[PDB]
Design an enzyme around this catalytic site. Structure first.
Site, short mmCIF file in Angstrom:
data_model
loop_
_atom_site.label_atom_id
_atom_site.label_comp_id
_atom_site.label_asym_id
_atom_site.label_seq_id
_atom_site.Cartn_x
_atom_site.Cartn_y
_atom_site.Cartn_z
N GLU A 43 42.25 52.86 54.64
CA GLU A 43 40.86 52.57 53.95
C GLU A 43 40.87 51.24 52.93
O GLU A 43 41.86 50.93 52.32
CB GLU A 43 40.24 53.58 53.11
CG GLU A 43 39.20 53.50 52.32
CD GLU A 43 38.59 54.58 51.39
OE1 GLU A 43 37.30 54.45 51.25
OE2 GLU A 43 39.50 55.49 50.90
N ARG A 45 42.62 45.31 30.97
CA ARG A 45 43.25 45.96 30.07
C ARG A 45 44.51 46.75 30.05
O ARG A 45 44.92 47.67 29.47
CB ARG A 45 42.18 46.89 29.75
CG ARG A 45 41.66 48.03 30.78
CD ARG A 45 40.61 48.87 30.21
NE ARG A 45 40.43 49.82 31.34
CZ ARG A 45 39.46 50.93 31.10
NH1 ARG A 45 39.12 51.19 30.04
NH2 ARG A 45 39.23 51.73 32.45
N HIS A 61 39.30 40.94 39.12
CA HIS A 61 38.45 41.72 38.03
C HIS A 61 37.09 41.08 37.75
O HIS A 61 37.06 40.05 37.09
CB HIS A 61 39.43 41.95 36.84
CG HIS A 61 38.85 43.07 35.97
ND1 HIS A 61 37.56 43.22 35.67
CD2 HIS A 61 39.70 44.32 35.51
CE1 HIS A 61 37.65 44.59 35.09
NE2 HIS A 61 38.62 44.95 34.86
N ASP A 102 48.19 53.89 36.96
CA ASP A 102 47.36 52.97 36.13
C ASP A 102 47.23 53.21 34.75
O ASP A 102 47.20 54.51 34.39
CB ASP A 102 45.82 53.28 36.41
CG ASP A 102 44.71 52.47 35.71
OD1 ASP A 102 44.82 51.45 35.44
OD2 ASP A 102 43.65 53.20 35.39
N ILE A 103 47.51 52.32 33.84
CA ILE A 103 47.77 52.15 32.53
C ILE A 103 46.64 51.52 31.74
O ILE A 103 46.65 50.32 32.33
CB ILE A 103 49.25 51.74 32.04
CG1 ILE A 103 50.25 52.52 32.91
CG2 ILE A 103 49.48 52.27 30.42
CD1 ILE A 103 51.76 52.23 32.60
N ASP A 104 46.07 52.07 30.88
CA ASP A 104 44.83 51.29 30.23
C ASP A 104 45.15 51.30 28.83
O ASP A 104 45.60 52.18 28.13
CB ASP A 104 43.58 52.12 30.38
CG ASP A 104 43.09 52.18 31.95
OD1 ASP A 104 43.33 51.15 32.63
OD2 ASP A 104 42.53 53.19 32.34
N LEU A 108 41.34 55.44 45.16
CA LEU A 108 41.12 54.13 45.13
C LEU A 108 41.86 53.31 44.16
O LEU A 108 41.79 53.91 43.01
CB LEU A 108 39.99 53.39 45.34
CG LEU A 108 38.91 54.05 46.65
CD1 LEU A 108 37.42 53.91 46.46
CD2 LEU A 108 39.68 53.63 47.93
N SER A 149 46.37 44.47 35.80
CA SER A 149 45.18 45.09 36.31
C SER A 149 43.83 43.91 36.25
O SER A 149 42.83 44.17 36.78
CB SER A 149 44.63 46.21 35.54
OG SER A 149 44.52 45.93 33.99
N1 LIG Z 1 33.49 54.06 40.34
C1 LIG Z 1 34.63 54.13 41.08
N2 LIG Z 1 34.73 54.86 42.27
C2 LIG Z 1 35.76 54.77 42.72
F1 LIG Z 1 36.06 55.62 44.09
N3 LIG Z 1 37.12 54.49 42.45
C3 LIG Z 1 36.85 53.78 41.11
C4 LIG Z 1 35.91 53.71 40.52
N4 LIG Z 1 36.29 53.03 39.18
C5 LIG Z 1 37.52 52.86 39.49
N5 LIG Z 1 37.96 53.23 40.47
C6 LIG Z 1 39.34 53.19 40.89
O1 LIG Z 1 40.15 53.39 39.72
C7 LIG Z 1 41.22 52.40 39.53
C8 LIG Z 1 41.40 52.45 37.94
O2 LIG Z 1 40.11 52.32 37.26
P1 LIG Z 1 39.99 51.12 35.75
O3 LIG Z 1 38.88 51.29 35.06
O4 LIG Z 1 41.50 51.38 35.05
O5 LIG Z 1 40.17 49.73 36.58
P2 LIG Z 1 41.31 48.95 36.88
O6 LIG Z 1 41.47 48.46 38.14
O7 LIG Z 1 42.92 49.33 36.43
O8 LIG Z 1 41.35 47.54 35.70
P3 LIG Z 1 41.30 47.70 34.17
O9 LIG Z 1 41.54 48.90 33.64
O10 LIG Z 1 42.22 46.54 33.76
O11 LIG Z 1 39.70 47.66 33.50
C9 LIG Z 1 40.36 51.20 39.89
O12 LIG Z 1 41.38 49.96 40.10
C10 LIG Z 1 39.85 51.61 41.17
O13 LIG Z 1 38.54 50.83 41.46
MN LIG Z 2 41.83 53.82 34.43
MN LIG Z 3 43.16 50.47 34.50
#
Ligand SMILES: Nc1nc(F)nc2c1ncn2[C@@H]1O[C@H](COP(=O)(O)OP(=O)(O)OP(=O)(O)O)[C@@H](O)[C@@H]1O
Ligand SMILES: [Mn+2]
Ligand SMILES: [Mn+2]
Ligand SMILES: [Zn+2]
Length: 382
Positions: free
Chosen positions: A39, A158, A319, A104-106, A311, A155
């Site tokens: 996917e 953050r 980003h 995933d670390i924030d 996902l 990422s």
């Molecule tokens: N609304 C969402 N729906 C789905 F299905 N997956 C989602 C949604 N928002 C984030 N994700 C997934 O979770 C992961 C972690 O969410 P996150 O907010 O931590 O995003 P990131 O890619 O790690 O980037 P930053 O932390 O640096 O802001 C994202 O990479 C994916 O898109």
């Molecule tokens: Mn996250």
């Molecule tokens: Mn993140």
């Protein structure tokens, strides 16, 4: 953010590393339909996104990405059927079967122990939390679990991601994934909880080895950059983590001291003489360790790692809130990684035509990190 469409168009046409990307997710092509059952989820303009995208080969992926020019690309699980055919499948048969073990670390999750930034902000003063997170977790993955193929990624805003890609890891169930997370977790509790770390009398090797990693960075990160014992406003937050019967003794020695380095040294001496149990005469640095762990030990976005179908933003995706490209992190230079030199899509599109592939831009060394990770995967397959 209005410039994104034409910048993305150039990025996907001339810069995105398609050949390396397919070499990754095709995993040698030894297993049938492995790439074809993967996917992808594209996010388009205005936060509109499509689930259950799948492709036949590298060419089909190129054409669809250059046709859709998505703002970001998420990677999901490998399913029992072609995800783009999931509506023709009889109900209940469409199932996620394999996916890399991801983390995933924030930085936001550290707001209670950060003084420099909050929310989605980051700076050089707090990025060391990510340096310690990578080294603590990667060591455990490598040495404790024997996982050999680990891709760390920035990422884009953050924090960082890790992709564990050993073929047996990709088969793990949700239950085992949760068990791995639990093994790796020590900081537990929301904003409601004051003290988030409690250690047993006997320290498991994972905890000892993680403590010793933090010890390498603690002085400059916590006592200088963060100055966690600067004044009463901040050093009372640390006294909340120790018993009351020693608050008085520490309160005075702090005011008599002049900087965090001296005040930490006083806390260690008092803490290692506190009697935790009146039955025995056994003393130790448990409180010292609990403080260092609560301020520095990695805090995972746990739900990202437990679900098989979850996902995660792809490497080399943009980003859309910062323009930064999600770039692999050179594990051999982890201490030197600077998220603020990470190129934006606008920056590399400028380099490309300043007087036509990624080697002509600042994205090149990040692709080389990805290639080193790819060559180790190909070696494990021979
Ligand atoms: N609304 C969402 N729906 C789905 F299905 N997956 C989602 C949604 N928002 C984030 N994700 C997934 O979770 C992961 C972690 O969410 P996150 O907010 O931590 O995003 P990131 O890619 O790690 O980037 P930053 O932390 O640096 O802001 C994202 O990479 C994916 O898109
Ligand atoms: Mn996250
Ligand atoms: Mn993140
Ligand atoms: Zn900061």
């Amino acid at each position: 953010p209005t410039e994104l469409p034409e910048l993305l168009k150039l990025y996907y046409r001339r810069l995105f590393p398609y050949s390396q990307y397919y070499r990754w997710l095709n995993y040698g092509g030894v297993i049938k339909n492995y790439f074809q059952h993967r996917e992808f989820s594209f996010t388009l303009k205005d936060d509109i996104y499509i689930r259950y995208q799948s492709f036949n080969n590298q060419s089909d992926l190129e054409k669809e990405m250059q046709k859709m020019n998505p703002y970001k690309i998420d990677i999901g699980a490998v399913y029992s059927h072609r995800p783009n055919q999931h509506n023709t499948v009889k109900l209940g048969a469409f199932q996620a079967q394999e996916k890399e073990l991801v983390f995933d670390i924030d930085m936001t999750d550290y707001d209670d122990v950060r003084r420099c930034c909050s929310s989605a902000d980051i700076c050089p003063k707090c990025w060391t939390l990510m340096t310690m997170a990578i080294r603590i977790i990667d060591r455990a993955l490598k040495e404790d679990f024997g996982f050999k193929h680990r891709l760390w990624v920035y990422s884009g805003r953050r924090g960082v991601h890790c992709w564990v890609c050993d073929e047996s890891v990709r088969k793990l169930s949700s239950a085992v994934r949760s068990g791995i997370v639990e093994y790796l977790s020590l900081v537990k509790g929301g904003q409601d909880v004051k003290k988030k770390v409690h250690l047993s009398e006997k320290i498991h090797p994972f905890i000892r080895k993680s403590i010793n990693i933090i010890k390498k960075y603690f002085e400059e990160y916590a006592l200088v950059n963060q100055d966690i014992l600067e004044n009463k406003e901040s050093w009372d937050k640390i006294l909340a983590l120790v018993p009351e019967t020693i608050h008085d003794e520490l309160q005075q020695s702090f005011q008599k001291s002049h900087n965090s380095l001296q005040r930490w040294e006083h806390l260690k001496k008092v803490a290692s003489r506190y009697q935790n149990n009146i039955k025995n005469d056994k003393y130790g640095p448990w409180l010292e360790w609990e403080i260092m762990l609560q301020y520095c030990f990695p805090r995972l976005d746990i739900n990202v790692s437990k679900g098989i179908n979850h996902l995660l933003k792809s490497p080399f995706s943009v980003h859309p809130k910062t323009g930064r490209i999600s770039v692999p992190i050179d594990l051999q230079k982890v201490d030197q990684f600077d998220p603020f030199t990470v190129p934006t899509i606008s920056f590399i599109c400028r380099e490309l035509d300043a007087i036509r592939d990624y080697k002509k831009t600042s994205l090149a060394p990040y692709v080389k990190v990805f290639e080193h990770f790819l060559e180790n995967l190909d070696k494990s397959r021979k």
